[PDB]
Amino acid sequence: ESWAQSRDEQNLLQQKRIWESPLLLAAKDHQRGAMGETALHIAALYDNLEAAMVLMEAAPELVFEPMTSELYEGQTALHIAVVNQNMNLVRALLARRASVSARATGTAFRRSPCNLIYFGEHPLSFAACVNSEEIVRLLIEHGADIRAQDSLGNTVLHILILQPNKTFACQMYNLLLSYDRHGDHLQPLDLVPNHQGLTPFKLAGVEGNTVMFQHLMQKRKHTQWTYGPLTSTLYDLTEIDSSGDEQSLLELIITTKKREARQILDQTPVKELVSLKWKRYGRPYFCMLGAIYLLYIICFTMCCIYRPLKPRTNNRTSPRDNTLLQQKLLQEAYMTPKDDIRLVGELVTVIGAIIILLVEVPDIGPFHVLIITYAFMVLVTMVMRLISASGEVVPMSFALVLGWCNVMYFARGFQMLGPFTIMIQKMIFGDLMRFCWLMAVVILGFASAFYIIFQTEDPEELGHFYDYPMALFSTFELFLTIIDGPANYNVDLPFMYSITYAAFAIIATLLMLNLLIAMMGDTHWRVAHERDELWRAQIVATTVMLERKLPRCLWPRSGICGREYGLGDRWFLRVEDRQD
Amino acid sequence: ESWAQSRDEQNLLQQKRIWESPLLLAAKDHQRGAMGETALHIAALYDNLEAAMVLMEAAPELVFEPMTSELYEGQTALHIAVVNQNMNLVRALLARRASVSARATGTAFRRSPCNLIYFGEHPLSFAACVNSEEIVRLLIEHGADIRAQDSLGNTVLHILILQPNKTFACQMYNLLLSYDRHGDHLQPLDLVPNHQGLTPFKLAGVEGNTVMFQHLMQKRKHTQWTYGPLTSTLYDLTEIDSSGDEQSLLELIITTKKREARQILDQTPVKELVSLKWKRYGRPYFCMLGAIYLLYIICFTMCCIYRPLKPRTNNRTSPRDNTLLQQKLLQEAYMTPKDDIRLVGELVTVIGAIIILLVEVPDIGPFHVLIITYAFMVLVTMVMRLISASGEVVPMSFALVLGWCNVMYFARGFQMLGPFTIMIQKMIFGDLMRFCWLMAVVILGFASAFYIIFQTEDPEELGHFYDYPMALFSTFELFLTIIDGPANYNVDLPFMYSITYAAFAIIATLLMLNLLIAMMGDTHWRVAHERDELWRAQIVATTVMLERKLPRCLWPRSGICGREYGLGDRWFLRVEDRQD
Ligand SMILES: CC(C)CCC[C@@H](C)[C@H]1CC[C@@H]2[C@H]3CC=C4C[C@H](OC(=O)CCC(=O)O)CC[C@]4(C)[C@@H]3CC[C@@]21C
Ligand SMILES: CC(C)CCC[C@@H](C)[C@H]1CC[C@@H]2[C@H]3CC=C4C[C@H](OC(=O)CCC(=O)O)CC[C@]4(C)[C@@H]3CC[C@@]21C
Ligand SMILES: CC(C)CCC[C@@H](C)[C@H]1CC[C@@H]2[C@H]3CC=C4C[C@H](OC(=O)CCC(=O)O)CC[C@]4(C)[C@@H]3CC[C@@]21C
Ligand SMILES: CC(C)CCC[C@@H](C)[C@H]1CC[C@@H]2[C@H]3CC=C4C[C@H](OC(=O)CCC(=O)O)CC[C@]4(C)[C@@H]3CC[C@@]21C
Ligand SMILES: CC(C)CCC[C@@H](C)[C@H]1CC[C@@H]2[C@H]3CC=C4C[C@H](OC(=O)CCC(=O)O)CC[C@]4(C)[C@@H]3CC[C@@]21C
Ligand SMILES: CC(C)CCC[C@@H](C)[C@H]1CC[C@@H]2[C@H]3CC=C4C[C@H](OC(=O)CCC(=O)O)CC[C@]4(C)[C@@H]3CC[C@@]21C
Ligand SMILES: [Mg+2]
Ligand SMILES: [Mg+2]
Ligand SMILES: [Mg+2]
């Protein structure tokens, strides 16, 4: 906001600085403006060729001079004439020995959501982005280095992938790569990583640049044979399944926050790779990891069904006291064979909860949080068991609910069941997290109204609202229509009740059907229309988690290795498809 | 998986075997490779004409030699040059006396979902499938037999129907059939069955090859007269209603597992045939078979309403014992006129259940299973009645529910009601069989939580959860909101209950609306959009069942017989339509 305010004022400052100097005004159609610009910059800016030539005759040092602002730092007139595509000025600027290697470190050039363009820092990178082949053919003739890297580390190959017109990005990727012609450099330009470690092939995957993914994939395709309609294609599979030493391209797509990246999961070498590694080793481990967790939660349940309880030593403290049984002490808890059989299962439970923490906590989405909370609630149950602290029903009840709802995590192994878990998340963190603020406020209004209406009345007849916390809970239950409307029929209720509850009943049906239409638009189109895409993104997330947390003996590398077939040491995936 | 692994390794083995031999490498641009191939095979594979000619000059025995692998067994170079459509090589191979009758018995050629192509075994069958008319015009000139049959028994007529480009399949069907020119053979080529017994006309129906159904139907159309816009067309109806000796084409479409086959039910001779036989004899028997079954289930109900019961001889065994009446013994069950009137209806019931087993069990979808289970539960009721075994309420209650829900089978006679039964099946074996795994797991988590919260409390106030099987059943009922939320208001419930039940109530509404949107997508588009198609497939299934299980006197053959009209002994169906 404040920065956007300053840019505009600096841009309005610049228009004043042009008007003050008649020479700078003449350039518009040694003094410097608000942006640090010169007359050569302004003539290049508005494509004033004749003003630029007359100024460069007087000052030929003006060509070398960069803008001095923070917004346009390092920018020379050559940058301006390049993006404005004035060919004859670019020729004239190079004739006056313009630097083709100048770096524009200005904030307006840096990759940021505030800036609409990201063109890099070098005139090659500016020229390729504005799609001028000739200037690229002209700048390299004057010593411009294609291997130039930015503050982000991007070369021009990386920058073209980050451009909104993906078709022009393809041709300029072709042109600059054809101009390398070096074998002496340890990395060719397609193989040069940026500072994040992403190659141009990896960058197209992370950004969801689909056509740049496809063009780069043709370099990694070898066609073995063609049998009429059939053809056999062998895929390099080096970067899309790099594992054991570095993050995979599949791993980068999952961790990135771009929904466009997940379309790359539907591209051909990626798709059969994921489906193969899922069917080969992905499913039978995950269903085995599912069955072990299910027997664990059943073992945790039985220890909670048979928890140590004794008749209460105390007398009843009120007529409203319903307690009959209390927790045993520690020595009382274990003195019999049934207590020893439970002690085995409770020890299995705690050892299971410790193993959960070991495979989860030293590592650091939602099912991460649910199982860590479940393992945490188990340890609190043991701690209270050891010190004989009362209230163990509170950690267990969290753990029974959290422990069983983790069993729903293993629905994603089945193809139909997995997007149903997607529905549950989007309904609760979308439509529920929105509408609960409208919904609780109606509950607070009517529960307060319902409380004071029965505040004079006797609670024995109608105790829905006997104190204010129960009046909140009852009105919540009346909202969802899970308990009946309060009625006695043997006594006179207040007349203000019948008006309020009829007003409540209309709003509660109206608001609850509104939550249904909101959850209608969610699960129908966002999830059930895209069930195959969402389930595939679940597999890649599940498998990458499996690969990190499993030994090498269990997980063989996917594809077929060369050097027994003379292809390299790389792991190749063969796909046979029908071209018809 | 493992077989797909082996094929790729064998394909990568083959690329090594080419590189080792310089002669085999020269063929790529007497030794044999991994696939058993030769240099002539590899030259034919990559369309290397000049390498093939030089090799066949040296070895002319190489033309005769087949590949020796399991994957490509029996394949010669003539097969390879045919599918690759190298005309000049095919001419050159025939000039060296190539076998046109060689059979490729390899696993890659066999019809299987692992193999993308099914081309048959003979070079005629390969040439027609890759759509080369000239090679077919050339191979027959060298002695190729069109009547060749595979291990599946398919001739080239059958194979063309099994091809994904149905338009090219039509022309090659025309070309090969025009080349038969034999009357001496007992079956012409359109009439030659495969090993399954299917002709090319029957095969197009079973596979749902609609345009091959239409082209073959024109041969079975005779146009009687044309009256301006009106025309009268007479259909052969021989194979689409073969009955009394063999399965019909209608019967093949029902029993097959292809959804594409049911579009053939909407083709013109099929459609009016089904609608005619349904209206003529299909409905009035089925509604008669419906009314007889309805009076049977009403008779079974009245025998269960009036089942023999006496006051209990024992005393009450607990304060929680609600039993007042018990079953009579066998001699007590029948000693009065009302007992004799029930004995008639019970004998009608058992004789009815035996007749169900006779018309169902010696024969061996869902309503098959439901009525056999109903007839089985009836016989258990009699067995327990005879030996005075207690617990007869268990077989009856299964039989009352199963017996009445069979009456829903007769909804398909009515056109609107039939797809509603489709909805019930798809919702229960789709959306229910999926979502019950997510839904029971939430129930198990909260019922366990609800149990231990009230494990200390006294059950007399709140006995929803007094033991663990009732806590499961109550939480199931709270999930569907068919019983009210537990509340006392005269006693203090645990505070962990109000948190857990509010957590339960949100999830239970959220998950239950999710089941509604899932059942929304089911019944709307899968069934109600396709209600006429689903109801028509119900008729064909019902009628074919009727034809098997009814005497000849009740079911006359459809159409109009010739030989009283001089058309043959075949049964013809006349359809008058408006061509406008
Ligand atoms: C007494 C001992 C031998 C019992 C064995 C304990 C297991 C029942 C637990 C221990 C650690 C495991 C778990 C821990 C880590 C994973 C991650 C997993 O899901 C996520 O959190 C993924 C993130 C997301 O998708 O939201 C939860 C279960 C899983 C496979 C495991 C399931 C069950 C395991 C084998
Ligand atoms: C004893 C009571 C008070 C415990 C409180 C209940 C809630 C805190 C928990 C338990 C049941 C729910 C969970 C149950 C299952 C879902 C699935 C959901 O789905 C996904 O992760 C799909 C995306 C993916 O990871 O692939 C994530 C958490 C969620 C809403 C829940 C998180 C929180 C909930 C509301
Ligand atoms: C969407 C809406 C507009 C539906 C239209 C129906 C309501 C406008 C009517 C239905 C019958 C109700 C009435 C029925 C009876 C009650 C009792 C009330 O006075 C009493 O008798 C209270 C009893 C007592 O004092 O003991 C006055 C009107 C009231 C709330 C109601 C006013 C309005 C209600 C909701
Ligand atoms: C004492 C006697 C004379 C009473 C007569 C007994 C009938 C009530 C039963 C005997 C066998 C019959 C049935 C047995 C065979 C059929 C199959 C039918 O449905 C299927 O199973 C088709 C498969 C499917 O679509 O799922 C169910 C009832 C029906 C017509 C019959 C309905 C009723 C019938 C006439
Ligand atoms: C006493 C209690 C414990 C009996 C248990 C009830 C269920 C086992 C049964 C009885 C009612 C249901 C049936 C009722 C009717 C339907 C129609 C459905 O319809 C079709 O077959 C349409 C397809 C076709 O055949 O054309 C098949 C079975 C189904 C879901 C049900 C099969 C199973 C259900 C759940
Ligand atoms: C979709 C959701 C987020 C809608 C928003 C409403 C809930 C957040 C509020 C509504 C009023 C409820 C509260 C109302 C009163 C209860 C009683 C409880 O303590 C008691 O008084 C128990 C009684 C006893 O100990 O005898 C503490 C909070 C609780 C569960 C509630 C906490 C949260 C609830 C569900
Ligand atoms: Mg949402
Ligand atoms: Mg009620
Ligand atoms: Mg379904």
Numbering used by the authors:
A (entry chain B), B (entry chain C): 27 to 55, 73 to 407, 423 to 638
Question: Which lines from the publication concern this structure?
Answer:
Member 6 of the vanilloid family of transient receptor potential channels, TRPV6, is a master regulator of organismal Ca2+ homeostasis. TRPV6 acts as the major dietary calcium uptake channel in the human gut3, and as such, this channel remains constitutively active, while its activity is regulated positively by membrane lipids such as phosphatidylinositol 4,5-bisphosphate (PIP2)4–6 and negatively by Mg2+ ions. It consists of four subunits and features a transmembrane domain (TMD) that houses the central ion channel pore, along with an intracellular skirt primarily composed of ankyrin repeat domains interconnected by three-stranded β-sheets, N-terminal helices, and C-terminal hooks. The TMD includes six transmembrane helices (S1–S6) and a re-entrant pore loop (P-loop) between S5 and S6.
To avoid possible interference of Mg2+ inhibition with CaM-mediated inactivation, we utilized the C-terminally truncated hTRPV6 construct (hTRPV6-CtD) that lacks the CaM-binding site and has been extensively used in the previous structural studies of TRPV6 as its function is identical to wild-type channels with the only exception of lacking CaM-induced inactivation. Single-particle cryo-EM analysis of purified, lipid nanodisc-reconstituted hTRPV6-CtD, henceforth referred to as TRPV6, in the presence of Mg2+ yielded a 2.97-Å resolution hTRPV6Mg structure. Besides the densities for a magnesium ion tightly bound inside the channel selectivity filter and annular lipids surrounding the TMD, commonly observed in the previously published TRPV6 structures, we observed four spherical densities, one per hTRPV6Mg subunit, around the intracellular entrance to the ion channel pore. Each Mg2+ ion in these putative Mg2+ binding sites is coordinated by the backbone carbonyl of K484 in S5 and carboxyl groups of D489 in S5 and D580 in S6. The pore in the hTRPV6Mg structure has two narrow constrictions, one at the selectivity filter, formed by the calcium-coordinating side chains of D542, and the second at the gate region, formed by the hydrophobic side chains of L574 and M578. This pore conformation is typical for the closed-state TRPV6 structures and different from the open, apo-state structures. Typical for the open-to-closed transition during TRPV6 gating, the narrowing of the hTRPV6Mg pore is accompanied by a ~100-degree rotation of the S6 intracellular portion. During this rotation, S6, which has a π-bulge following the gating hinge alanine A566 in hTRPV6Open, becomes entirely α-helical in hTRPV6Mg. By recruiting D489 and D580 into coordination, Mg2+ ions, therefore, disfavor the interaction between D489 and T581 and stabilize the closed state, accordingly. Mg2+ binding to the D489-D580 site prevents separation of these residues and rotation of the lower part of S6 that accompanies channel opening, thus locking the channel in the closed state.
